[PDB]
Amino acid sequence: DPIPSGALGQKVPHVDESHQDLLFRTSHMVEDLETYDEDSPINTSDANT
């Protein structure tokens, strides 16, 4: 419930299926901090079908 902090105490995201949205794909972000997941089971539902 308290917001996660990182190794330097900086703000860190909490992750669950919310981060696999429509407006957060193609986000401009460094790969170290990018949370969109193109292998997530909710973005890969009908791939190669």
Binding site: A47, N48, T49
Partner: protein, 88 residues
């Protein structure tokens, strides 16, 4: 892009005169001569109007008239992901 070259009239007239030696039609020396003449409409002559006719426009016709010589993303990738590209 269409390639245009400007040349001196003497050089180009000499070329067209030389090329008149082959048996198939080729740009004339007299067509080079006419290249320096702009169209001059007689002030007193009947026109398309007297035939109750209305000429079409070159810009609207050009695409149809020239069709055989025509040269020829973000959503497409996402849509492509759902299809099959390789099979057994």
């Amino acid at each position: 892009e269409v390639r245009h070259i400007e040349l001196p009239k003497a050089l180009y007239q000499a070329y067209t005169k030389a090329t008149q030696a082959i048996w198939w039609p080729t740009y004339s020396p007299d067509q080079v001569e006419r290249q320096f003449l702009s169209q001059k409409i007689d002030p007193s002559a009947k026109t398309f109007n007297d035939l109750d006719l209305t000429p079409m426009e070159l810009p609207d016709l050009m695409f149809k008239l020239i069709r055989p010589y025509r040269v020829n993303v973000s959503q497409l990738e996402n849509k492509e992901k759902t299809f099959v590209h390789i099979l057994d």
